[PDB]
Amino acid sequence: MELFKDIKNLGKLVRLERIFNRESEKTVIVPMDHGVSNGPIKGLIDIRKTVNDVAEGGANAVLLHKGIVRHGHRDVGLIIHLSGGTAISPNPLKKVIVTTVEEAIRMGADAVSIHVNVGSDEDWEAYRDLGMIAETCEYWGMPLIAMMYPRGKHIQNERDPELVAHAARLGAELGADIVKTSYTGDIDSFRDVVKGCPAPVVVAGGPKTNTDEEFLQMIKDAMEAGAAGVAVGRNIFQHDDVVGITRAVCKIVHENADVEEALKEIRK
């Protein structure tokens, strides 16, 4: 598997092959950690069902907080989130480490993820968390997915091409094996994010779009820009046909299908 030809860590390779597709060397991750920051939103109320439908649709892995896993009436990959913060907090952009890598390992997870809002108050504390966690991940052979987003007092456009690219880069620099970040709006600027970041980049889905057209076109665009896959939550689990929209996404990501052939998977 060429993608991580450079990775010199047996452990990481083994677990990585459980979240990435062998043929395409791309990944479809369904993040479902919104519960912590936004409460029980649409699609994440009956988590057991969502995980099932998404798995059924062909997702390679789900990303959850440890508490949801332990209550799990569990065949896909499991990524455990280590960051926490909420929208009701005096500082909604603050993220602290709420779970350890070791805890994720003893639960059988295949990878862990951390969220860093670059530009938020005292964001340097999160820089250190990422750097340290990257080292403990390296030691345990645990793949690390760093969700890097430009966010704070002075950032008007958390999707700005320069900022998003700087943030993804930062993530690769501090040891992240994979980086999650926002699509910048156009194939060219996002291709810069991809080229400026030594680690594979995976795109976030963002808020639920008005039409499947919009959402699927963005995936196709991101893949074209060089994305190693996708990590979308809301646009999948808040969709009326979760299994269908998931298949659509897989068509685009693993089979290079176009939006038209992709839309045929959605139940009308």
Residue positions counted in the chain: 268
Collapsing DSSP to helix, strand or coil, 97 comes out as: strand
Interatomic CA distance for residues 257 and 263, integer angstroms: 10
Kindly give, in sequence order, each residue whose CB lies less than 8 Å from that of residue 128, ignoring residues fewer than 6 positions away. none
Cα–Cα–Cα angle for 96, 64, 134, rounded to 5 degrees: 50
Task: Tell me if 32 sits within 8 A of 68, measured CB to CB.
Answer: yes
Q: Could you say which of 94, 95, 110, 149 is catalytic?
A: 149
The token pair at 150 is 């430009």
- Mask of contacts with a second copy, 22-61, x by CB under 8 A? x----------x-xx-xxx----x-x--------------
Interatomic CA distance for residues 267 and 186, integer angstroms? 28
Q: Is 37 annotated as a binding residue?
A: yes
Contact between 118 and 167 under an 8 Å Cβ cutoff? The reply is yes
Considering only 31, 43, 85, 244, the residue that binds a second copy (CB under 8 A) is 85
Active-site annotation holds for 149:
yes
Stretch that binds a second copy, among 80-88, 232-240, 243-251, 256-264 (CB under 8 A): 80-88
Q: Of the two residues 64 and 262, which places its CB atom closer to a second copy in the complex?
A: 64
Is 34 labeled as ligand-binding?
Answer: yes
Residues in region 130-169 near a second copy by CB under 8 A: 130-132, 134-135, 138-141, 150, 152-155, 162-163, 165-167, 169
CB of 17 or CB of 241, closer to a second copy: 17
Q: Which is nearer to a second copy, 9 or 235 (CB)?
A: 9
Strands (E), 57-168: 61-64, 77-81, 83-84, 96-97, 111-118, 144-150
Indicate which single residue of 27, 113, 120, 235 sits in contact with a second copy (rule: CB under 8 A).
120
- Picking from 267, 243, 242, the residue whose alpha carbon sits closest to that of residue 43 is 242
Site string for a second copy, 90-109 (x = CB under 8 A): xx--xxxxxxx--x-xxxx-
* Of residues 198-257, those binding a second copy (CB under 8 A): 198-199
* Binding site, annotated residues: 33-37, 149-151, 205-206, 233-234
User: Which residues are known to be catalytic?
Assistant: 33, 149, 180
